Design a binder for this molecule. Structure first.
Ligand SMILES: [Zn+2]
Lengths: 169, 216
């Protein structure tokens, strides 16, 4: 019995690059993980369900090139609306030509080629082992909530819904 | 003479395929299952007849259990001969033979299960009475069948267990094989359970003159 990559990363991150070209066969597993996080196994007479709690980081490529003044985001990519709804957050990074930004981007890229070191700046790169140590320590921590905090969430949600009823544009 | 057969039926209790244990080997049982494969009606050798190569003496009624068995001692003690016989295929008696594969019923199968199988042997007048896809109740005797290939078959055709697929490594040495017998040599004999059936039942003309005959 050989588990997949989704099962392999438990309490971890699955980085799915080029998610547009990936077939519906994998779309079934992606659909089921976000629903119940328990992968049903092949039909080779074992009837096994395996824990698959995982987080998903997907990278997408819009259909036929770049962003299109076609209004619907559903038109930009092939992904179904139901699949995109299960995603917690969606980020669009469109490449818009601006004369100022291109100069700094070119300078930043060329400094790396001239000198292999990254361009020195007031920003300090924190040591990666410290990154891992803090991330793990934060992961071990367990928060807790109060009744007063969640009361404002209801007001936020009702305001968002009252916006969404007219937000259809 | 007509080789007779006795058919038993209407046994009190019926068994499923998953109740087959080695402690009923040799007993009279009845089983139920769904047929999934049938073979051709082949002729089986029942009463063999041979002729000594030198004396030309005729031996008859040489019983055979599971492999081609020739006689050992010549009819005349004057002759000394251990082998080199010639089967008289015309004088020998034959019988019909058929092998059918059955599996468990849809209800007896648990919630998650790979169905169990069995080999049932139909012989004599019981051939072709079980058709694939049907549900049939068999009755007969539970037997055990050895591996004849390592029992020294005469021909070189067996070629000491020629195979096309790989055997299970899990049961390599786990399947208990008995040794010691002189016919085996240093080999190990193995057994498997099969069923031999004597009675089969199923549980799942525009001519005026002949038509008037059947009705009461
Ligand atoms: Zn002789």
């Amino acid at each position: 019995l050989e588990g997949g990559a989704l099962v392999l990363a438990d309490n971890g991150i699955c980085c799915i690059d080029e998610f547009d070209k990936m077939d519906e066969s994998d779309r079934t597993a992606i659909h089921e993980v976000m629903e119940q996080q328990t992968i049903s196994i092949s039909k080779a007479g074992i009837n096994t369900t395996l824990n698959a709690r995982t987080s998903i980081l997907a990278a997408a490529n819009p259909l036929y090139g770049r962003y299109n003044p076609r209004l619907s985001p559903l038109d930009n990519i092939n992904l179904p609306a139901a699949l995109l709804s299960r995603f917690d957050i969606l980020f669009l990074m469109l490449d818009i030509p601006s004369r100022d930004d291109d100069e700094k981007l070119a300078e930043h890229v060329t400094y790396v080629h001239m000198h292999n070191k990254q361009p020195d700046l007031d920003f300090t790169p924190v040591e990666p082992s410290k990154m891992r140590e803090y991330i793990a320590y934060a992961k071990t921590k367990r928060p807790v909530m109060s009744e007063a905090v969640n009361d404002y969430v209801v007001q936020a949600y009702i305001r968002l819904r009252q916006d969404s009823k007219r937000e259809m544009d | 003479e007509r080789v007779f057969q006795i058919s038993f039926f209407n046994l009190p209790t019926v068994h499923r395929i998953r109740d087959i244990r080695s402690e009923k080997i040799g007993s009279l049982l009845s089983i139920s299952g769904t047929v999934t494969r049938t073979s051709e009606v082949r002729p089986e050798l029942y009463k063999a007849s041979f002729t000594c190569d030198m004396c030309r003496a005729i031996v008859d009624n040489v019983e055979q259990s599971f492999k081609y068995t020739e006689p050992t001692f010549c009819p005349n003690p004057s002759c000394e001969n251990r082998a080199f016989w010639t089967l008289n295929v015309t004088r020998s008696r034959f019988l019909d033979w058929q092998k059918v594969r059955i599996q468990e019923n849809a209800n007896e199968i648990p919630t998650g299960s790979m169905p169990r199988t069995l080999d049932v042997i139909l012989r004599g007048d019981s051939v072709e009475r079980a058709k694939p896809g049907d549900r049939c109740k068999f009755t007969g005797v539970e037997i055990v069948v050895p591996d004849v290939t390592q029992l020294g078959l005469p021909g070189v055709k067996p070629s000491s267990t020629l195979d096309t697929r790989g055997i299970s490594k899990t049961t390599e040495g786990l399947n208990s094989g008995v040794t010691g017998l002189r016919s085996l040599g240093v080999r190990d004999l193995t057994y498997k359970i099969s069923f031999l059936a004597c009675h089969v039942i199923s549980i799942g003309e525009r001519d005026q003159e002949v038509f008037l005959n059947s009705l009461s």
